[PDB]
């Protein structure tokens, strides 16, 4: 029976099959060292004698799993044969222990497990909440609001986006309760289903998204002058977020931060306006970082007239996106999440790419 | 509490609160009838000196649950209180509402549960899901993860699955009918109400598929099918075998295999006698997958694009990571809109798709 790394454990003094690639290998003639590495790891393997092909070359190892607390995993597999299925014909261009070949590597490679990992929360949570997952080609996810009342959607925006869109909402701030108790999921399904590659990258966990630190963005630009020294301009920047993120860290200890009430003239003609200015829309920042961004949407047909000539553009222009809203669409709000991003501060990694496959 | 129109039949002689939407209304004096549609169906709601708002209009319903075997569920809700929460201006004519009808959706709902089973199974076997920028970079990720799948368009909605260290093509057929059940299983399991909406005929136990050679299908769609096919087989020669396979195996499936190496790209394991390790599935006559195991030897590959005249130095990009042993691996892709349209019965591809 095939074994991965991962369970080798409970075979100690047994016959196993393994199938992986060859991640390195130590030619001492009688005696062979070779590292092989599955989905799940690597292992040890001894053999000797053998003509052995190159690294990277795609092996089928058969023998007995003994004890080593030296080797990887504290395991070892002494071969009794090794069939290589697909001998790799030239020495890898950087020594792997080029994406389409270093990408192969355990820490290469974990981010984009650990995302699949986080998708997977993502889309469970919400199922549960009765969500339905939609496949559109910001205006039709709020006409499948209207279909649906509650939906979301995973797709590229190049970045992966995880978007939300609920409807019969109080205000923005069931967005914010909703994403807290989503990304808790998320997280949760990384931890269970992805342990290993969290550890393996030696990322240290974030602190638990709930109850997260609400701040205006009234309220965070006066920090950033009054007690950053930081010149606030227009709107948020890199660099404002990311000094209120270390603010936050400090102040709550808390890695993330909800900035709230945006100035009417920075969120789109779509955002409920509020009266004092603001809008009821929300930036999540996650150690320092933009993670999401969103809000509660203008339901009233009337309304979206009036705000769209308070932003010098032609309605006229809009007639097709006004349309559905002339048919009772519910009050509603969404957000959409940075899927890399997230990834990215949640696993300490240098940049985005590092999240993304072949950026 | 909010209550959803299916659940209704656990709280007859209690106060529930509905949300949704104004499916039709008449007034009668006094007192009017209304249909409140929310997204798990439609209850019909008595009111009384209520202003009726255009139909379309959302609106919160607090009332009484009663019986009434004269009333779509059997039961109805004698509203309290009512309030519009959105007005609705114009009448009702295009699809940014006509899609919001129980049938109009019902095909959408069943296939975010046949996607919710595709991934479901898939993980649970250990697959890794993917996000690409194509059949290079799931083929390059086979390398990385050993089995991953991506669902996203390519216009149409693509599943798409890849795997490695396998035997043959045949792991794939085989991986592919457990899959499927899995899916219809999701749907039937989460989504049987629109199922039932629609009236569509479950098909045949996705299990032990018929599989048939391209040769053989040629032989019968020819000679006992009456039809002059050609080297590719077209939607009408498709269709044939579909009621071929029907009748003789009483399935609603086909596995058609072997096709022959010219019709089928540069990358795709090739048999001496000519055919290739590919196939494609026909499920109520119509192609809902292929796939096949691919060449994963370098010097292979460069064979197969002279064969085919094909100019390797154009390929050089292709080729790189076909020199750093990629194990024997193949895929296929399942139309997901396809499958429903067939699977619910549906007229059109575009009815299972939200915008056309």
Do not use: C
Not at 152 to 174: K, Q, R, T, W
């Amino acid at each position: 029976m095939r074994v991965l790394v991962r369970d080798l454990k409970a075979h100690v003094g047994q016959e196993v099959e393994l199938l992986g690639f060859l991640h390195w290998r130590r030619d001492l003639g009688r005696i062979q060292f070779l590292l092989l590495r599955d989905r799940s790891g690597v292992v040890q393997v001894v053999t000797g004698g053998l003509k052995l092909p190159l690294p990277e070359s795609a092996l089928r190892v058969r023998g007995l799993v003994v004890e080593n607390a030296k080797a990887p995993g504290g395991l070892e597999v002494q071969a009794k044969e090794v069939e290589v299925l697909s001998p790799a014909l030239e020495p890898t261009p950087v020594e792997i222990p080029y994406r389409y070949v270093t990408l192969r590597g355990e820490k290469a490679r974990a981010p984009l497990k650990v995302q699949a990992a986080l998708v997977r929360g993502f889309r469970r949570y919400l199922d549960r909440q009765d969500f339905t997952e939609i496949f559109t080609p910001q205006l039709y996810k709020q006409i499948m609001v209207g279909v649906f009342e509650r939906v979301y959607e995973v797709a590229p925006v190049e970045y992966l986006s995880l978007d939300v869109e609920m409807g019969f909402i109080a205000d923005e701030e069931d967005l914010m309760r909703l994403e807290e108790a989503l990304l808790a999921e998320m997280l949760e399904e990384a931890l269970n289903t992805a342990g290993d590659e969290i550890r393996l990258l030696g990322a240290t966990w974030p602190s638990f998204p709930q109850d997260i630190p609400r701040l205006t963005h009234a309220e965070a630009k006066r920090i950033l002058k009054e007690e950053l020294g930081y010149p606030v301009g227009q709107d948020l920047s890199e660099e404002a977020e990311r000094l209120l993120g270390e603010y936050a860290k400090e102040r709550w200890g808390s890695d993330w931060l909800f900035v709230t009430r945006y100035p009417r003239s920075v969120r789109p003609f779509y955002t409920y306006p509020e009266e004092d200015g603001t809008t009821r829309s929300f930036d999540l920042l996650f150690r320092g970082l933009e993670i999401t961004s969103g809000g509660q949407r203008i339901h009233r047909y009337e309304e979206l007239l009036e705000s769209l000539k308070a932003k010098g553009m032609d309605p006229e222009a809009f007639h097709g996106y006004l349309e559905v809203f002339k048919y009772g669409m519910p009050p509603h709000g969404g957000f959409a999440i940075g899927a890399e991003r997230l990834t990215q501060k949640l696993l300490g990694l240098p940049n985005v790419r590092y999240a993304r496959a072949f950026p």
